[PDB]
């Protein structure tokens, strides 16, 4: 039944669509995945075959002359449908060994029909409105989540260099403890000779003043440590939530897109579409 089908009716024939449109369809797909579009009007050739091989898109021009179609002279095929079906059942190695692959998986223009089986325009347009609404909602939810995500990441960064600033501070006040003790062991030891304990209540009142300030600084950077650990937790919690929203987002966009496709076929006025979108 295949070879007599009109090219228009072919599932893998997408008419005049962009290479960019083709690219999105083929993005991250298994080898053998393919479709046909019209060639650029400004170039020689009629149709462009695009298939996946080795994680890359391969574009193969299809030419016409005097009833015959093909990739290169001589043109041996009676129609484009005949060409495709041939390479569905045979490797393109025959055309070129440097790509040994069959056309296994046609990207179908009827795919959405498989998804949306409701045959009523207004009803399909109704679901599209709901699907679009749910998707726009999830999108904004994700947006506010990313906003907090960045703000949190930034405030975590500030706290961290502040922690280092505290450490460096603490290191100095320790060095000052070291300095005073370094120099004291002579004077004090010589000044408990000559019976001066009054020279202590000044020297010692200062040592404990220094030690007190140290404790306060350590206490303050202990605080910042807990604050940071807390906010770092919020960060990872925000990340989790966003990672939950992401899959739902993509699926919602893809379902919306299919319902757009189904309604774009059957030729719904752009105006009617935009009420639903």
């Amino acid at each position: 039944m295949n070879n007599n089908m009109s090219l228009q009716d072919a599932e893998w024939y997408w008419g005049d669509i962009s290479r960019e449109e083709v690219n999105e369809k083929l993005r991250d797909t298994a080898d053998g995945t393919f479709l046909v579009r019209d060639a650029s009007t400004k170039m020689h050739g009629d149709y462009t075959l695009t298939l996946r091989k080795g994680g890359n898109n391969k574009l193969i021009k299809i030419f016409h002359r005097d009833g015959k179609y093909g990739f290169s002279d001589p043109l041996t095929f009676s129609s484009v449908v005949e060409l495709i079906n041939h390479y569905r059942n045979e490797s393109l190695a025959q055309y070129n060994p440097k790509l040994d692959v069959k056309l296994l998986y046609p990207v179908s223009k009827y795919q959405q029909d498989q998804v949306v089986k409701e045959d009523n325009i207004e009803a399909v347009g109704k679901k599209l409105h709901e699907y679009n609404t749910q998707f726009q909602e999830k999108s904004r939810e994700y947006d506010r989540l990313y906003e907090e995500y960045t703000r949190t990441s930034q405030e975590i960064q500030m706290k961290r260099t502040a922690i280092e600033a505290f450490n460096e501070t603490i290191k100095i006040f320790e060095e000052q403890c070291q300095t005073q003790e370094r120099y004291s062991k002579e004077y004090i030891e010589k000044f408990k000779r000559e019976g001066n304990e009054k020279e202590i209540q000044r020297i010692m009142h200062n040592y404990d003043k220094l030690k007190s300030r140290i404790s306060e600084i350590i206490d303050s950077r202990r605080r910042l440590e807990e604050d940071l650990k807390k906010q770092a937790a919020e960060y990872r919690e925000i990340d989790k939530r966003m990672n939950s929203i992401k899959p739902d987002l993509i699926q919602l966009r893809k379902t919306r897109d299919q319902y757009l496709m189904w309604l774009t076929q059957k030729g719904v006025r752009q105006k009617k579409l935009n009420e639903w979108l």
Binding site: R19, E168, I172, D239, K240
Partner: protein
């Protein structure tokens, strides 16, 4: 703020002081106080406390503390306001300073410019970093020598580069504005200390060199036969300087080649040039001094081509991912071997495992012979999540790794990689465009991998080995073959046609095979090189080797073509090297200034720290201060970005070390910008719910502080370093109505001739909105206007100044005498026409309508092409003279295309009856006039003009793909302009497309090819 947690420090504060005797003294201090008196107020009180016998005079002791940036900073300049030290906490340690004082001062000054303490580089273990640190210096000294060679002409040409167009050749309509090829130019002088000015008006040829202009000056009742006397002896006695400007004409150029003169010509305005004594200038030059900084096995290494094995990589485990085990079923590691953005083979996944346990421990196998791995080969990975009978995949985190390091060494053994958060908007599982290397933030998902170890150091072959293999390959297959087999016209023609396709139009497999077949003939048509490079099998060393040989000898191409080769589709260093060398030879300073935004962005794509591009750019930055100025700012504006933080920081250090005196000017600018950032932070955080009136008073009393006054006055505009910002006019400074509370600022122009250019300079400071997008749009617009001018199409655009100076922080040039449409309409479709009538009434009306019409045409075309955000009456402004322009472009390339499903190209700028009437000079039926039909033709021309130059714009966009700008994360994003320019269509089909888009947008009002005289 001025202290930690503070936005502003209270007037009086206590300072713990740590004496070298081991004592500690609290002290009263004013937030205004300087360290000098603080020391003096200190040792005064130090005696009261014990051991003060051992304290020496305040002479030999210096203050040291910790900054907000966690650096231990000694303050050698003691004239600093306490509020300006940026202390972490109010303590000072007094010590006798040790080490090289002058170099420590420089280091702190560089750090302040850089936004990060320079000592952080010292710690870095990565040998590539320390190597960059060292080796880059050769460029610095190479550059400083260049400016001392021809001194002090060499010196002044660095500080005051001539601002010239790329060509002295004048477009017809520009020349025809001149009188008999001549121009009137007023020269001024200062007679005496009285400083009244005395003008010598002139009429000379537009192509006159400054000397000749200086000659005709001293002329304007004595001996003629002698008059050669002075002009020979006194010529370099003076030099020409733009009035109100820091612009000089120090070089031999036709006067019309200087941008100011060219601008004056188009604007129908009269050039005012001041006569300045050469001595007064050449001596005032710093003669700044650059000083070299302190940081100045038996295994018999294997060649890559000797290793007989298929590539394989072992994914071990990850520390964690942030995931709900409720919502996520499984995780796995996705993986790819890339050359630029194309997989060299099939991407390979690890098995799927539970989210609770990220453990794989499996060797992934790739079908690529290890000798076949190209030089620029990269490992790209991500950890992915999986979620009837169908599933969704999402990236959780990503990372890229160069398979070869900067020493051409193949990676081996166990390495750990800290991953990056996925950029907003990116749904692709892998991210090959993203930077390479591990996330510097270690509190992050860490993936462990293991590369094979081949028992030696494995190195990529040297070029002579590559050439050897190439010769072998071409011989075994079946040059000298080029001239042996003659090139048929049939093939000669196809090659020419293929060369015409735009950079983003894929080539077919037939075209690939055709191109590679004729690779030996391709050198007769060198601009085809990017297509030839795309036809190569980069996973075949046989073909890459051969390609290398052709690249080696390849004829040079135009810089704008060379720029195409600098995007992420040409990672190979031999290709990039060729591209850079083309820039070295044929790229003018003028065009480097124009394209600087993109070239800096490309640096992100570079595999390694040290490359030919950055050495070229640094050298330019260090030999031309105007270039160095924007070079600095573009780099600095992204210092917040951890992906380029280390790279840009290291580069910025190099620049700041060799740039000389300009570092002091830059620091003043940085200082000023910081305070405007802090001030607007506070307004937004603290004063958010206060009235706009209270906000202003707070601003004034905050700005009126003499420490702010010192900061916000007497510095150079980051928008234009030639523009001096003098005294603030605080009374006229305002907060705009917008949400992020932009500051409309007003400075005096301190120039003595300022009244002849502009007496005051107004700049909008904006904190909160990303200005990268608008910065780019205004660049493109300028470039478009350039295309049109040299094409004879006079369409006045207004690419006003816009510069991103930080994370969502930037400056916007205020255009004088301009009003929004809403300001004009607010009260009838004739209002606008009436408004500008009253502004230009009399016989000057027709110049104004003309100007308006041209301006509209250019923006209508420009905005349709770019797909900027919708225009409304607040988006659109008019000037007194009639010129229309746009502001606040926002998203481009139709970024609101998704979040809707509609795939159509829209028309952001639709012409209401209001606009049409103005073009119609009031006509009742405004769409049927002679003026409107002619307006259409203007658009039709401008459109086709841009289409012819499409490659330039596509290239410029491709270079930005790593920017981080949401509007272009992908080549799919750039593709929007291919659609608006209808690049896959015939030219005649493109115009029809345009007309159609207009007709649909104007509801039939655009008319069509179908006209009725009937």
């Amino acid at each position: 703020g001025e202290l930690w947690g503070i936005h502003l420090m209270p007037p009086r504060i206590l300072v713990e002081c740590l004496l070298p005797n081991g004592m500690i003294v609290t002290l009263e201090c004013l937030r205004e106080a300087t360290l000098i008196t603080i020391k003096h107020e200190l040792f005064k009180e130090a005696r009261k406390y014990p051991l003060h016998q051992l304290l020496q005079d305040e002479s030999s002791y210096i203050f040291v503390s910790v900054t907000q940036e966690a650096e231990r900073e000694e303050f050698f300049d003691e004239t600093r306001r306490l509020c300006d030290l940026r202390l972490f906490q109010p303590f000072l340690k007094v010590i006798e300073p040790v080490g090289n004082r002058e170099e420590k001062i420089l280091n702190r000054e560089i750090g302040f410019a850089i936004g990060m303490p320079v000592c952080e580089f010292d710690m870095v273990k990565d040998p590539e970093v320390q190597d960059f640190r060292r080796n880059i210096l050769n460029v610095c000294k190479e550059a400083v020598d260049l400016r001392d060679l021809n001194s002090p002409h060499s010196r002044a040409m660095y500080v005051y580069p001539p601002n010239v167009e790329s060509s002295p050749e004048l477009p017809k309509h520009i020349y025809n504005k001149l009188d008999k090829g001549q121009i009137i130019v007023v020269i001024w002088v200062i007679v005496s200390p009285n400083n009244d000015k005395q003008k010598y008006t002139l009429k000379i040829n537009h192509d006159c060199v400054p000397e000749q202009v200086i000659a005709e000056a001293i002329r304007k009742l004595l001996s003629s036969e002698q008059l050669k006397l002075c002009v020979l002896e006194y010529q370099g006695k003076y030099i020409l300087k733009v009035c109100g400007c820091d612009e000089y004409f120090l070089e031999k150029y036709p006067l019309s080649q200087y941008k100011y003169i060219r601008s004056c010509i188009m604007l129908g305005r009269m050039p005012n040039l001041m006569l300045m004594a050469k001595e007064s200038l050449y001596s005032q030059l710093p003669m700044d001094c650059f000083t070299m900084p302190s940081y100045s096995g038996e295994t018999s290494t294997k060649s890559l081509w000797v290793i007989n094995s298929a590539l394989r990589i072992k994914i071990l485990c990850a520390t964690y991912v942030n995931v709900n085990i409720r919502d996520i079923d499984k995780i796995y590691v996705r993986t790819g071997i890339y050359h630029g953005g194309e997989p060299l083979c099939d991407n390979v996944n690890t098995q799927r495992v539970p989210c609770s346990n990220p453990r794989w421990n499996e060797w992934l196998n790739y079908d690529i012979y290890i000798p076949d791995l190209p030089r620029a080969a990269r490992l790209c990975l991500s950890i992915c999540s999986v979620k009837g009978a169908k599933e969704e995949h999402c990236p959780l985190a990503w990372g890229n790794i160069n398979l070869f390091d900067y020493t051409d060494t193949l990676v081996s053994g166990k390495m750990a990689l800290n991953l990056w958060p996925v950029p907003h908007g990116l749904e692709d599982l892998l991210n090959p465009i993203g930077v390479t290397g591990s996330n510097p933030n270690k509190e992050t998902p860490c993936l462990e991998l293991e590369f094979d170890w081949f028992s030696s150091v494995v190195k990529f072959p040297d070029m002579s080995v590559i050439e050897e293999h190439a010769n072998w390959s071409v011989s075994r297959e079946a040059n000298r073959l080029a001239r042996d087999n003659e090139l048929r016209e049939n093939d000669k023609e196809q090659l020419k046609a293929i060369s015409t396709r735009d950079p983003l139009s894929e080539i077919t497999e037939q075209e690939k095979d055709f191109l590679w077949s004729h690779r030996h003939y391709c050198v007769t048509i060198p601009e085809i090189l990017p297509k030839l490079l795309l036809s190569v099998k980069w996973n075949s060393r046989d073909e890459v080797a051969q390609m290398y040989c052709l690249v080696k000898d390849w004829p040079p191409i135009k810089p704008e073509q060379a720029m195409e080769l600098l995007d992420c589709n040409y990672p190979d260093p031999m290709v990039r090297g060729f591209a850079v060398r083309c820039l070295e030879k044929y790229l003018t300073d003028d065009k480097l200034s124009q394209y600087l935004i993109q070239l800096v962005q490309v640096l992100k794509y570079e595999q390694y720290l040290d490359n030919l591009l950055v050495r070229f750019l640094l050298k330019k930055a260090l030999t031309n201060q105007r270039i160095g100025h924007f070079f600095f700012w573009h780099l600095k504006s992204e210092m917040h970005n951890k992906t380029v933080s280390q790279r840009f920081g290291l580069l910025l250090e190099s620049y700041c070390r060799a740039c000389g005196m300009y570092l002091k000017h830059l620091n003043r600018q940085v200082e000023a910008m910081e305070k405007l950032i802090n001030l607007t932070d506070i307004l937004k955080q603290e004063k958010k719910d206060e009235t706009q009136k209270v906000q202003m008073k707070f601003l004034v009393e905050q700005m009126r502080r003499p420490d702010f006054m010192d900061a916000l006055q007497g510095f150079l505009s980051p928008l234009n370093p030639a523009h001096q910002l003098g005294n603030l006019r605080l009374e006229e400074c305002r907060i705009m109505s917008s949400a992020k509370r932009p500051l409309w600022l007003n400075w005096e122009n301190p120039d003595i001739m300022s009244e002849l250019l502009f007496q005051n300079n107004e700049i909008i400071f904006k904190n909160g909105d990303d200005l990268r997008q608008d910065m780019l749009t205004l660049q493109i617009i300028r470039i478009m206007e350039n295309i049109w001018q040299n094409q004879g199409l006079d369409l006045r655009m207004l690419p006003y100044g816009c510069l991103s100076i930080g994370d969502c922080v930037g400056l916007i040039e205020v255009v004088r005498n301009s009003h929004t449409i809403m300001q004009i309409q607010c009260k009838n479709s004739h209002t606008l026409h009436q408004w500008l009538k009253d502004k230009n009434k009399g016989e000057i009306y027709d110049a104004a309508i003309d100007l308006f019409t041209r301006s509209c045409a250019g923006y209508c075309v420009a905005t349709f092409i770019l797909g900027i955000g919708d225009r409304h009456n607040s988006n659109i402004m008019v000037k007194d003279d009639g010129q229309l322009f746009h502001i606040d472009f926002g998203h481009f390339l139709d970024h609101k295309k998704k979040k809707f499903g509609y795939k159509r190209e829209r028309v952001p700028f639709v012409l209401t009856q209001d606009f049409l009437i103005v073009i119609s000079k009031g006509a009742q039926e405004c769409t049927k006039t002679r003026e409107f039909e002619r307006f259409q033709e203007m658009c039709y021309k401008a459109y086709l003009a841009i289409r012819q130059h499409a490659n330039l714009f596509i290239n410029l966009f491709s270079m930005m793909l790593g920017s981080g700008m949401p509007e272009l994360q992908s080549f799919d994003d750039i593709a929007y302009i291919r659609k608006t320019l209808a690049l896959d269509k015939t030219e005649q089909e493109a115009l029809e497309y345009f007309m159609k888009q207009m007709n649909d947008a104007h509801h039939g009002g655009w008319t069509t090819k179908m006209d009725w005289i009937f």
